[PDB]
Structures are given as C-alpha cells and as structure tokens.
From a paper:
The Linker of Nucleoskeleton and Cytoskeleton (LINC) complex crosses both inner and outer nuclear membranes of the nuclear envelope to mechanically transduce cytoskeletal forces to nuclear contents. It is formed of nuclear SUN (Sad1 and UNC84 homology) and cytoplasmic KASH (Klarsicht, ANC-1, and Syne homology) proteins, which interact within the nuclear lumen. JAW1/LRMP (lymphoid restricted membrane protein) is an atypical KASH protein that is localised in the endoplasmic reticulum and outer nuclear membrane, and is specifically expressed in certain cells of the immune system, small intestine, pancreas and taste buds. Here, we report the crystal structure of the SUN-KASH complex between SUN1 and the non-canonical KASH domain of JAW1/LRMP (herein referred to as KASH6).
Thus, we crystallised the SUN1-KASH6 complex and solved its X-ray crystal structures from several crystals at resolutions between 1.7 and 2.3 Å. KASH6 peptides are clearly bound at both of these KASH-binding pockets of each SUN1 trimer (these are herein referred to as KASH6α and KASH6β). The third KASH-binding pocket of each SUN1 trimer is located on the underside of the trimer-of-trimers structure, away from inter-trimer interfaces. In other crystal structures, at resolutions of 2.0 Å and 2.3 Å, we observed no third peptide, with the KASH-binding pocket containing only water molecules. In absence of KASH6γ, the remaining structure was essentially unaltered (r.m.s. deviation = 0.1 Å). Hence, the third binding pocket on the lower surface of the trimer-of-trimers structure cannot stably bind to a KASH6 peptide. We conclude that the SUN1-KASH6 structure is a 9:6 complex in which three SUN1 trimers are bound to six KASH6 peptides. Importantly, the distinct KASH6α and KASH6β conformations result in an asymmetrical structure in which the N-termini of all six KASH6 peptides emanate towards the top surface of the molecule. Hence, uniquely amongst SUN-KASH crystal structures, the SUN1-KASH6 structure is theoretically compatible with outer nuclear membrane insertion.
Author numbering:
A (entry chain B), B (entry chain A), C (entry chain C), D (entry chain C), E (entry chain B), F (entry chain A), ...: 618 to 811
J (entry chain D), M (entry chain D), N (entry chain D): 529 to 555
K (entry chain E), L (entry chain E), O (entry chain E): 543 to 555
Write the structure that this text describes.
Amino acid sequence: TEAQARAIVNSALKLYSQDKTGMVDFALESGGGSILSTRCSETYETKTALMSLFGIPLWYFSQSPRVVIQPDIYPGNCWAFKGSQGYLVVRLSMMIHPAAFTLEHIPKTLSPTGNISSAPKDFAVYGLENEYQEEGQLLGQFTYDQDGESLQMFQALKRPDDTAFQIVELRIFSNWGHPEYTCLYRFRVHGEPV
Amino acid sequence: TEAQARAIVNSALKLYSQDKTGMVDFALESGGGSILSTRCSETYETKTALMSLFGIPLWYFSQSPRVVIQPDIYPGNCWAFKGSQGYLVVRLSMMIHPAAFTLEHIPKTLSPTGNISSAPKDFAVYGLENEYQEEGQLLGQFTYDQDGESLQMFQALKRPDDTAFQIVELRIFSNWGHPEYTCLYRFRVHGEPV
Amino acid sequence: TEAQARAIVNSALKLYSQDKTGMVDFALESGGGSILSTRCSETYETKTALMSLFGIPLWYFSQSPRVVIQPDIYPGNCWAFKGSQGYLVVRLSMMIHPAAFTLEHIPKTLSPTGNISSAPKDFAVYGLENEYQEEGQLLGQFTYDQDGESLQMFQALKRPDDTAFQIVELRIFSNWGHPEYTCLYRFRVHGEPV
Amino acid sequence: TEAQARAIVNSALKLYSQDKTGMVDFALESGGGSILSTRCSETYETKTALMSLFGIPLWYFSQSPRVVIQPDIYPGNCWAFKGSQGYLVVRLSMMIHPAAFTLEHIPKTLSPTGNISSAPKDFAVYGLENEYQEEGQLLGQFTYDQDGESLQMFQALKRPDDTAFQIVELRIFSNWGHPEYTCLYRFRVHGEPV
Amino acid sequence: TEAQARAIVNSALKLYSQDKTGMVDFALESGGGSILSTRCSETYETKTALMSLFGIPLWYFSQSPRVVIQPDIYPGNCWAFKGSQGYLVVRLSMMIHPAAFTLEHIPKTLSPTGNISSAPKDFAVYGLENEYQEEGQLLGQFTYDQDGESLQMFQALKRPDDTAFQIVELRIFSNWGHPEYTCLYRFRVHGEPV
Amino acid sequence: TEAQARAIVNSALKLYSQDKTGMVDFALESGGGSILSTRCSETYETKTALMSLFGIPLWYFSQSPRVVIQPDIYPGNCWAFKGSQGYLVVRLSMMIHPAAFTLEHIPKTLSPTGNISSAPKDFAVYGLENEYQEEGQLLGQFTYDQDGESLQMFQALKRPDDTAFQIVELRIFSNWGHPEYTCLYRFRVHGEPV
Amino acid sequence: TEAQARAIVNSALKLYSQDKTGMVDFALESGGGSILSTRCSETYETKTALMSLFGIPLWYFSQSPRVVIQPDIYPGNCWAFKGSQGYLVVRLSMMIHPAAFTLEHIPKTLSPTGNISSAPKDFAVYGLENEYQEEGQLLGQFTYDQDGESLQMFQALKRPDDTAFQIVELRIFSNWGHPEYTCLYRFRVHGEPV
Amino acid sequence: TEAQARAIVNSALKLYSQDKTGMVDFALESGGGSILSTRCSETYETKTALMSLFGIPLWYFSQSPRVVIQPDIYPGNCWAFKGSQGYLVVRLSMMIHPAAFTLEHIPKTLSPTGNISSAPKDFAVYGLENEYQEEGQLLGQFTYDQDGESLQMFQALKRPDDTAFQIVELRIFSNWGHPEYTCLYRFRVHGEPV
Amino acid sequence: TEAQARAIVNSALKLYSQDKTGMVDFALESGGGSILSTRCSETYETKTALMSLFGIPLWYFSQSPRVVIQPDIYPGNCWAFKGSQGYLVVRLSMMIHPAAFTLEHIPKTLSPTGNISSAPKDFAVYGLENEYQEEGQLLGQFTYDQDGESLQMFQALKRPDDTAFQIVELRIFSNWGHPEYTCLYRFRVHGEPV
Amino acid sequence: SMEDSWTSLEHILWPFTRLRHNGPPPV
Amino acid sequence: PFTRLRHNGPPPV
Amino acid sequence: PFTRLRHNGPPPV
Amino acid sequence: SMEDSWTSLEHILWPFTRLRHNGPPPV
Amino acid sequence: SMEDSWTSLEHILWPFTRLRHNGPPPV
Amino acid sequence: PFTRLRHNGPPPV
Ligand SMILES: [Cl-]
Ligand SMILES: [Cl-]
Ligand SMILES: [Cl-]
Ligand SMILES: [K+]
Ligand SMILES: [K+]
Ligand SMILES: [K+]
Ligand SMILES: [K+]
Ligand SMILES: [K+]
Ligand SMILES: [K+]
Ligand SMILES: [K+]
Ligand SMILES: [K+]
Ligand SMILES: [K+]
C-alpha cells in the first residue's frame, strides 16, 4: 500500500534521474562522443539571432550539430539543418555493438507554434568502420512519431554477425512538414562495449 | 490500484519534465524570447560569477537580465537589480493573448542565509504594443509570496477586447526586505498565439 | 488512498526539485562557493592536449576542479586527479557549523565501462580556519559505497565546542580500483550558518 | 563702409570658428560628454561584416553612437540606427539647466543620393535624473527641417522650477523617408551650469 | 549695403562649410570610397618618422593612399609615392557619370621648405569598368598649377556617350621637381549618380 | 563696392583656411615637428579620453604633449600638465631664425565652467642649439591674456646676431588660477628657414 | 704564511661573492631600483626589426634600459643609446645620501672587435628631488678609463648640507670613439640610507 | 711557496665555482627538484617584480616559492611568505639519505635597510615518505645566524635506521624581527643517493 | 710574499670573472651567436617536466639548443638531444679564423647520479661557408675527458691557408655511456676576427 | 579545430553579449 | 584565421 | 600558428 | 585586409606612442 | 621564428607556472 | 600574419 507506493515513486524518480533511460549513451559528448562536422548536412543559417555588444551588432548565432549530443532539450536547444532531409555523423566514445537508439524532440505542448513540424520523421542509422567510408552497414530504419512520446527508443536490427562500430551515421530522410529546416534535439546510441 | 498509482506517477513525472507546467513559455530566450536590455533597470554589480578559459580563472562578472528568461534556477542564477524597485521588458517569441505569468525563486531551504529577503514581493505586468511605448495596458498586479511554493503562477486580467501583445513589462515595486538588491530567477509568460 | 498517493508523489517531486536534498549546499559555486585551486591536488594529465601554439602542444587536461561544485553530473563532467589519492579545498558561501556532506558519482548503469572503479572510495572531510594551515580539524572519515546509491550523504562528527568553518578540505584516500585517476562528480557541504 | 565690412566679416569668421555657435556644447565628447551606450537603441546592421574570425563574420556595423557627439560631419560620419524611430542617451560634461539643443545633418548638396531622407524629422529631448529612470522630463518637441539649414537650433521649454540635468535623452520619432535607417550627424546641448 | 554684405559673407561661409565646393565627393572614404591598394604606385618609405613606446623604437610611420580621400590637408597629411610619376586607383561610393575632379595641395605659404615641388604637375583621369581592367576610358588630361589656388577643379571631357563608372584611375605623369617623391593631399570626384 | 566686398570676404576666408595665420608652423607635428617628451614636465592624469575598437570601449587615457602640436582645439583637446608650472621642448621641422610664436586656448564662450582658469598665463620661450643643452637663449617673455582672443601671437626678441635654432623650449610659469593642472591646446613657432 | 694565504684567498672570494664590492647597490632592480624609462634617452635603433605584424616590421631594438641595473654583464647585455651622448634616470630602492657610483663595461679581452670604443667615456651623476625637475644637483663629474679595470668606482662630491635623493640621473657626455651608439653594462649607486 | 699558493688559490676557485660547496643539491630545480606548492605557506604579495615583453613593462608580480630552489641570490631574489612562520615542501631529484642542508641569505652589507630582519631565524627540517604524509621524521632543528656568514650549513640528525627520503619539509618558526614577511633566498639538501 | 699572494689571487679572480677564459666567445648568443635549429639533431623530448597553471597541466618543458650558447651551467641547464651521437650548427657573431673551442660539462661532484655518462665524449668541429653546405672543412677531432676538468679547451688544426668562417658545425660522435640522450652544457668558439 | 576555437570564443563572449531575436529561431 | 572583409555596400550616409 | 587538437582518447569518466 | 588590420592596430597604438622625426617627412 | 615566438611566450609564462618533475630531467 | 625576423646584424656590444 503506502510502502509500495513510495517504492514505485522512488523507482520512477531514480530512472528519471538516470538520463530518463538508465542506459549508457555512447554518443554523449561529455562522455567522449564527438560530431564529425565535415560529414554533416548544411546548417540552417538565418540572420534572426543577433548577438551584440554595447549595442554594436556582433554576430548571428546559429546552433552547432554538437547540441545533438548534449542533454539540454529546452525549445531551441537543437541543431537546425537546411531543408527537410539531412545527415549527421557521430563518433562514439567506445567501440560498441549497437543495440538501440534514442531520439528526443520537444512536446507539442512546449512548442510556441503549436506543432513540431520541424521534427525528424523518417530516418535510418548506419554503422561506419572508418571516417572516410561512404557506405555503412544499415543498423535500422525507423520513423519518429509526432503523436508519440517526447523520447522515443528504437531497437537496432539483429544481425547474425555482431560487428562493432565507433562511428554511426544518422540519415534523416524526412521531417514533419516544416519547409525551411529540420531540428534535432538529441540522439543517443546504446549498445555493448567490446 | 497499482496500475492507477503508476499512471499517477507517470503523469506527475511527465508534467515535471515539461518545464513543470506543460505550457509554452513565450518569454524563454532559447525559444525566441528576448530582453530589451535598454528598457531594464540598473544591474546590481555583485561580481559573484567567475569566468574561466581552459581551466584558467580570468575575472568576476555580474549577471545579465537575460538569466531571467533562462531555465537554470540554482541559487545565484538570478538577475540582481539595484534596490527594491526595478523593471524588465521582454519581447515574446509570438504575438499572443496573455493568459498567465510565472515567477520563480529559490525555496528558503536552499538559501544560505535562511531567508529569501531578496525575492521580489510586489510587482505588476503590462502589455506593450511596440517597444517604444511608455504607457502599457495593465495585465495584472500581484505579490510573490515568500511563504509560498518556489514556482508561483499568476492569472492575467481578462479583457473583453483581448488585444494581443508581443512585448511585456514586469515592474517590481518591492522585494522581501533585502536593502541592497532584488534577485529575479525566472519569469515566464503563457498564453495563446493569434 | 488516491489523495495520499498524489501527496506522496508531490512530496517526492518537491524534494527532487530542491536539489534532491532540500538542504543548502554551501559549497555550490553559483551560490557563493569557490575552489581554492592553489591548494588542490594536480589535475589528471590527459595523454593528448587540446591546443597547439607555435608547434607546442598546450592544455593536457579534461575538467577543472570547478566542476566538483557544479550540479551537472552527466558522465565526464567530473574532476579527475592523478592516482587514487588527492585533495580538494573549498571556500564555503558562508561561515557555518558543518552538519553533513554529500558525494555524488554516476551510477554503474551509466558508466561506459560497466564499472565506477574511478569513483572515490575512502575519504575524509576537514575544517580549516585559514586555507594555508597545514593540519585541519577532522570533520569525518567515510567510505563512498560502490554498491550504494548515486548520491550519498554522510553525517559530520559532533563536536562539544561549536566552532565554525568557511574552508573545508576533502581528502580522497582511495578509489574503487581505477589505476590511473579518480573522478569527482559533486561534493556538497551542509550545516548551520553562524 | 570698408571698416564696417571688415568688422562684419571678422565677426562672422569668429562665430564660425567658435564651433559655429559661440555656445558651450555640454554633450561634446572631448569636452566631457559621454554616450550611455547601454541605454541607446541598437546600431544599424550593415549587410556585410567587417572581420571574420574562425570562419565567423564579425562586426556588422558602420559607426558607433560616439560619433553623434563628435564635430566631424563629413558624409558617413554619423550614427545609423534601424528604422525611423530610436533614442540616444548622453551624459553631459556638467550639471546644467538646458537652454537649447542643436541638430546637424549633411546638406542635400553633399548627399550622394540627392536627398537626406535618412535625416531625423520628428524628435524630442528629455532630461533624466538617473540613466535608468523610465520616463524622463520633456524638455521639448521639435522637427528638423529638411528644407532648412544644415545646422538647426531648438529652444527648450521654459520651466517654472529650475531643475538641473546631467543626462539627456534624444528620441527620434521619424525620419525624412528612408525606409532602412536614420543617421544622426551631431547633437549638441546648450544651457547654464549650476 | 549692410544687409547685402551680411548676405555675401553668409553665402561665402556656407559654401566654405560645404567641403569648400558644395559638390558631392564620390571618392570620399567616409562616404563610401575606397583605395584599391594593389593598384597603387609604390609608397615612398623613409625611416625618418620613428614611433616608439617607452623609449623603445617600434615602427617607421609612412602615410597610406587612404589619406588621399580624407579631408585633412594640414602639411604632411598626404600620400607620398616613390619617384615623380605614379598612379592611384579609387573605387567610388556610387556608379556615376563623372563630371569633374578636384585636386588639393598645401599653399606655398604653409610649406616649411618654401616650395611645393612635391605637388603633382601633369596628370590624367581614366574610368575603369572592372577592377582588373588595365586600359580605361580617358576622362581628362590636366595640369595642377603650382602658381594657382590650393584647391583646383578640372572639368571632365564631354563624350557623346555618357558611360558611367565606379572606378577611376588617377595617373600622375609628373610632379613639380621634387627628386624623391610626390605628395597627394586630396583628390575628389564629382558627377551624377545613375 | 560689391566686388571689393567680395574680395575682402575671399581674402579673409583664404587666410582663415591657411591655418588662420598664412604662416608656416615649424612645430606642427605632421609637418616635421616633434616633442622631446623626455624634456617635458609631468602629465596630469585626467583619464578623460576614451579608447574604442570596433565600437567597443576599452579604457580611459590622458593626453600626450603631442597634442600641443596638433591642430584640433575643440575643448578637451589639450595637454594637461600637473600644477601651474611646466615646460615643453619641441624640435622644429627646419633650422630657422624664429620670428614669432602662437598660443591658442579655447574661448570662454566654449568652456563648460565659464572660465579658462586652466589656461597658461605667464610663459617664456628659449632657443636651444642641441637637445642636450640646459641653458638656452631667451627668445621672449609673454603673458597669454585670458581676456584676449582665442589665438594670440607673440613677437620674438630680435637679436643682432640671429643664431638659428631647431629646438625651442616653452616654459609656463603660471596659469589663470586652476589649482590642479594647466591645459595647453596648441603652440606654434614661426620664422624664416636658413 | 699558509694560514695567512688561506685568509687572503677567503677574503678575496668573500668580497667577490658580495657583488664584487661588499656595498649595497641602491639602483639594483631586483633590490628595489627602477628605470624611469619615460625620462631616458631613446634606445638605439637596430637596422633590422624583431617582429613583423600585418606586413609591418616591429621592434627595432636590442636591449631595454632595464639591463643597466641588472648584474649580468656578458657581452651584449647592455643598453645601447644612439650616438655618444645620452642619459638614464633611476629611482633608488631607498632615499639615500649618495656616496659613490660604479660603472662596469666588458674588458677589451672579451670584446669581439678588440676595442670597447662603445664604452662610456665622460659622464656625470646628478640627484633629483622629482623625476620631472629640469636641472638636477651635480653629484659628480667623472671619466670611465678605457685602460682601467672592467669595474670602476667613483667618489661623490662632499656636500655641506646632507640632502638625500631617491632619483639619480646618469649623463654620458662621450664614449670611447664608436660613431653609432654607446652601450651601458651596469651602473650602481652606493650611499647611506636616511 | 709560490706553487703551493697558486694551488691553494686554484682549489678555492674550483670549490667556489662548484656551487660554493662542491656537493650535489638534490633540491635544485634545474637538477630535478620541485616545489610542492600546494604544501607551501601563503606568499606575501610584494609586487616588486616587473614583467616586460619586448622592452614594454606589463605588470608587477610577486615571487614564487620556486625561487628558493634557484641559485640567483641577488637582493630581492627570494620567496617572501606572510608573517614570521611558514613552511615549504620540496621533492628531491633522487631518493637519498640526507646528510646536510644549506640556507642562504644576503649579507647585511648588501641589504638596503642595513639589517636582514626578514631572514629566517628558527627552523626545522623533516623527511616525508610520501607527499600526502602529515607527520614526518625530524631531520633537525636549527637557527640561521644573522651574525654569521651568508651561506650556512646544518648537519642532519644521524639515525641508526637511515630511512631514505625524496621529500623534505622546511618549517620556519621565526624570522629576525620583520613584522610583515620572511624572505627565503635559497635552501639546499645534500646527502647520498640509495 | 704577502703582496705577491694578493697579486696572484687578484689575477686568478680577474681571469675567473672574464668568462673563466679571458677569450672572446664568438658563439655566445648575447654577443651575436645563434643556433641554426633546422640543422640540429633531434631534441630529447620527455614528458617528465610538467608546467602547470592553477593546477592545470599546461606543457612539457624541454631545453632548446640555444642553452648551449648560454653561460649558465647549473645541472640541467643543458641541451639534451636524442641518442648518443648528434650535431649542432652555430652561426658566429663574426667572420673569424677559428683558433680554439671550449666544451663545459658539470663536474661529477654536482651531478645527482654520481656520473656524467651523458657528457659528450668523441666530437669534431667543422667550418661551413654557407648555411646550406653539407660538407665543411674539418677544424678538429677531439675527445671530452670525463676524468678531466669541467671546462676543457681544444686547439683547432693549423692549416697553411687560414680560411675564415662564420658557421661551425659541432658533431658529437659519442657520449660517455648514457643510453637515452646526450647533454651539452656550453660550447664556445675562439679565434681572430677578419 | 575551427568550430572548437569558435565555440571557445563563444563561451568567452556569451554572458556579456545581448541576444535579440528579429524573427523566430528554429524550434 | 583572421580576416578583414570587403564592403562593396556603401555605408549609411 | 594556432591549432585545436583532436582527442581520440576518451575523457575521464 | 592587411592594410585595414594594420590601420586598426595603428589607431589603437597612436595616442600612446611617441613620434620623433629624424629627418623631414614628405610634405 | 617558431622557436623564437615560443621562447617569448615561455618567458612570459615562466614565473607564474609551477614545475613538477615526474622523473629526473636530463642532466 | 605574425612573424619573427632574423637578425644577421650583430647586436650592440
Ligand atoms: Cl554561430
Ligand atoms: Cl606605416
Ligand atoms: Cl618546451
Ligand atoms: K540538445
Ligand atoms: K534563471
Ligand atoms: K559536476
Ligand atoms: K559626427
Ligand atoms: K588628406
Ligand atoms: K591641440
Ligand atoms: K647588465
Ligand atoms: K633564489
Ligand atoms: K648552458
């Protein structure tokens, strides 16, 4: 009864505090992940975020693909790339057998526009053996569901041969209708170290 | 009632993770809000923030009004203005009919001095049609309650002609007794876009 | 029962939102705490360096000791010192009688290697009347439990004479088996102001 | 007549050499006046930037507001703010009772475009007791005459109570038709010291 | 009589204050003109103007071709190029039909040496359609008269086809006898915008 | 007498444009004059000059004795030395027989305080044969008249053996009552080259 | 005799180890002496410069005047001023009555050219009550002996009134024949503190 | 006895050139010694050392404990710690059985004040087995004699079990009367390697 | 007797003070010598000398070949190159006929290790006519004697044709047994200028 | 390297600059 | 990387 | 010369 | 770009340097 | 040039850094 | 552009 309820609440809070998943994120930057910027799609650069010093216009702030592997997901703390399809290449902190992936986007209830049309829709994840390789091994094809939860997990394909990777490419084949850009809030990679 | 209890816990955690309100904050900087700094009162210079580069301390700075529209509210992460009276002008991310406002201050249990005497006490919120207008439409008069919860919500006045605003002015007429400054941790504006 | 369950959940969330403890952290940097870096053990030397200038590699370090008094504890946001023994000196936000201390480390479930062997194991806390005094007053000897919770609290020794301190030394005598370094995620000091 | 003509010419040259007015300019920067840039409207954003650093273009501006209180008024040595409305805050070299103000703009005959549509048209001058007070005391409402002389003087309102000011606000409510910016060449403040 | 004299004096002073000509200078740097330095003759570099800091010799100051499009013409505020013939290329602030040119040199009465032998003597002005074009359209051949006024204006050739230019090349074919260098104080370009 | 009147006006403007004197200033820095700063009295540190880079204010500096040989004489564009006594040593652009000297100070009508009490009052001028000589030849004793014109000329003593000088010393024995400093706007040396 | 010889050798070594003189050097920089560089003659201009920045050569000097009050006198560790006449101003570590002075130069046997023609020859020492006073009090006139020892001491003039000085001027009137510069290796001031 | 006398002189000079002792200094920094600065007492900030770059003075700094293990002992080349009590911890270049220690201070004849009141008076030396040990083995108690020679040697206590040390602690319990600081010029450790 | 002894001691001290040799060193850096770094053997780079700032590891200090032409020879003030054979190229301050060379190494009595196995053993000196020439003229083959004096001089070969050089190459063919590196403390070149 | 240097400079500059949104940022 | 950028666009006048 | 160096080695965790 | 950067630095340096003419400047 | 610039920077940095020998330096 | 210049000319001695 009361003790059972306190146990359930404590378990829920503990899981929430463990990055909401309780699973290692091998793409997390602070843990060792990095973005291969030269292998990323073009960043959407608008001139609408003006940084100024003593009233002097200084520079137009855009967001780096690095934010995709940073845990902050308040609205706007996302990488916006140009158009409605794009790609991101992440070097993991460790050589792992990839088991699952996680995509997070803001809920509609926190979006100023009422919609998340900029969220990724159709995407796939590939493993790469070297940073110069163009064609990777397909780790999975998925769709991020705009009517689903903010955080969504996707299970990687089971292959008879468990090949390890330290580089993964995320290809976004479509977004949810925004005509100008696509916004990625966070992408996580889960698996087993070698 | 185990499933119902788990559902209650899940709903509470979901709401908590949705910025504790589940409501868009149209003043949030990362989402599109901005401080019209030229229309803010004088900053109290505390010089309690250390800057560092590559682990090397460089100099001590004070906090910009910008922090009022940034979500971190650990003690010290607030904008301190001189005295017990001041004002802040925020440009919202969207043209909205304002419904409510939120003011946050640290709980007494986390204040080193045992009190929150620097917290705002008496304040009012006005809607402005352009950034150059002096006299705004009163959206409400309120008191932040030092014996209340850390996060407090305040309902805007309903006007029969709901004129929309994209600029709001927060006027703090009094604090809770600190004679040197008043520290503002976070201010949010909620409403419906046009 | 439903109202009681809602009350338990609300209480748990409230405590969680109050820095998980509901207690002032007099070491918290943003709240007024500071690292006396000149009196800290040397930061761990990372194999590779960050910059190169005039052909000379510079900055062979990951994290500054400052991170130990900052609330972010995502993996890697910790201060690493060389070996399994070290010390850290903190100036508190106020002159206090110390009551308890808190140590945080990442859970094993979020560690890329599967272990937290780099977590501190055997440590002690001392109060200092000046930062340059050689021998401080022992406030307590403790062990961080590798099979325990991520956040652990430790009760200070009761002293007959209520002497206050504003400088504390954390001494790590041992870690949980990592042979190269020890990483400190967060250290908190709780007590009563004078 | 010859002696009278020589006297008239000498008098005209003397007045011309005395800053064309023979009156103290309490706003003149070299004489002790200063621009409170933190309280000025934002400088006009020029399409192109001046520097580039690490691939990021920096400095999208032409002239600092300081030029408004400097005597050089060759074309281009003016402060441009965005649009047709703006404000400038000046700290005077002394605490004075303001008597008159001066606005200068280039003559149409020296404008490359043939017009001075970027010249200020409708403006007002206010006295401030502190730079952070919201509403200042109206010292006068004026129009700069596009068909008038390059230098124009404007008489301040006579107040029954002789209150002094050392801070003045110049508000430009309209320009002479330029749709992108307004350029201020020089603003002077004349009066009697206390 | 008296009124007529005052009118004459005011007209003379007004014209004097309008850059002494009352005509737009499309080469003036502050108005948008620029020097194509790579297309200028070699600067006369002497080691006779030593700049020092705390008694330490620092660098030898020469004057840039930029000064040629700057209004200051006190002795020495001129560009000295090597030899007695040279060239300067100026990009105008606007695409214009060039009507006239102006050359200024110091009067002999202000020259320390008693002569202006360094003044340009024989020169021509050409229009260029692109910065990479070697041969321009001759806009005129002129001589600067050492026994004439300090400021001298020259009318451009009347061509049946009014072709517009934004780049002009000034070729100095001879100076007034100085064996080491030639000094240009100011060059102006007048015409009609397109 | 219209043509004669226009001729009178033209002569007056011509003389005005020729540095107001129509005479070479052999101390003018741009023309070849230099300050032997090691032979100047102590600078009063006012820190009333602001330095800026790209519109960013950097720090406040005082004015170098060099300004005494630079033509700008707007209020504040003067060298302030400590007290009411001082000296300045100038190396002339040419070896000359000195004929006259000129001292300039701002008119009372442009001084913010209503007086020119910081102006030099009693001074003398000496000729020096080399920069290392202590005892010079007295070229004249003078007083700058606070009730006189802004620009004042002083005739040098005629010596039967006119030894030429290229170094002059200005000694100011008194100012017009300011107890803190004396401000020297411009000093000129006129004569005939050898 | 053996004990006497050992005593003589020990005495000689002791004196040698005590800066070769056994007397306080009140000019020694590390001991509190300083060079008033603003009052020193200009440093010798070396043909070539040290740096280049933006294509401009910078730093045409070898040694700062500071070396004159530093004990290293290996060849080249000397301050070179232009020509055969110059001066150096030193602030002493204490207010003293000056008793003697010391000049050091490299021996001919260590000079690459075989001569010490750049050594000072005729010099004088003056006491100054303020660093900006024109004429100092002569403390002595001396000649450095080119056929003498490397280190030479000179006795100050005995004055009836014991006036103290903390600023001394060294004037070099001549060198030993070098036509381009004079190099000072070390200058020492000895006396009695007040 | 001429040959014997020359031999005596040669032996004395040889010993003098061999660091005046002919004995290895295991604390010398260039040879491998190091200061454990985190285990040193507070530095007295004198700011009597000038930094310069290319002859340009930049700022005044105080002296690091490192100078205690550097051979230059000209007046001022010492580490000054606050008060009359302090400690210094040195890591030796080798694991040795310590035989003696050397303390140097300037002779009274080279001190500007006539006394060496800032010299250490009462001190003790301890051997430490690891850098983290608080209680060391007493290696000796000594007094530096202000009426003795500049360099003084002190014999370590002989222990029947000669445990070797690579870390030594110097504790200064008193100085010779200076109330503000104590200045330590050089400390050496001599012994036999294991 | 006594006078003869004082004369002998003074002569010995004088020679000692004259760089211990009384001979010009044309390789000495302060006198004009320089190291052709691109023509030097590889520097032994260990990671054992860690420089840190505020406890942050900054860089690993090695010694430059420049120290070989600097007079300081305390242990460690030497250039360590990789392996047991290497080369150094020195450009002399003057074009000379080389007469002799000097090599200095620390005495065994000051070496912490008890041996000087890192000292150069077998070496040769060659003269080069241009910096790009590979084969020079052999100036001599020598061995540095580990059982000899600290400073050792070597006479250059007598050639019938006295060819002058300003570049010399020192080739070390062997050291005294150290397996990792070879340490050069100082190398001097003596001869006659042209 | 370019992005890392820029982000270092951005971290230095961030708390002292003023941010104005002239239009909605990507969200 | 340090660069000065060229301004073909005329300044405000 | 100014350079940022790449860290393939994982940070302390 | 080179000249513009140099002139920026020159503007920074100008009021703090001392100028000595060792011979007549171009006039 | 590279070594000279580095040594200038090293001279600037030297008195403010701390030097730790983790092993014996070349001697 | 940042450069160190070579000095073939001997320093003052
Ligand atoms: Cl950006
Ligand atoms: Cl230049
Ligand atoms: Cl190095
Ligand atoms: K993110
Ligand atoms: K906040
Ligand atoms: K942390
Ligand atoms: K202006
Ligand atoms: K000019
Ligand atoms: K002036
Ligand atoms: K010296
Ligand atoms: K020392
Ligand atoms: K050496």
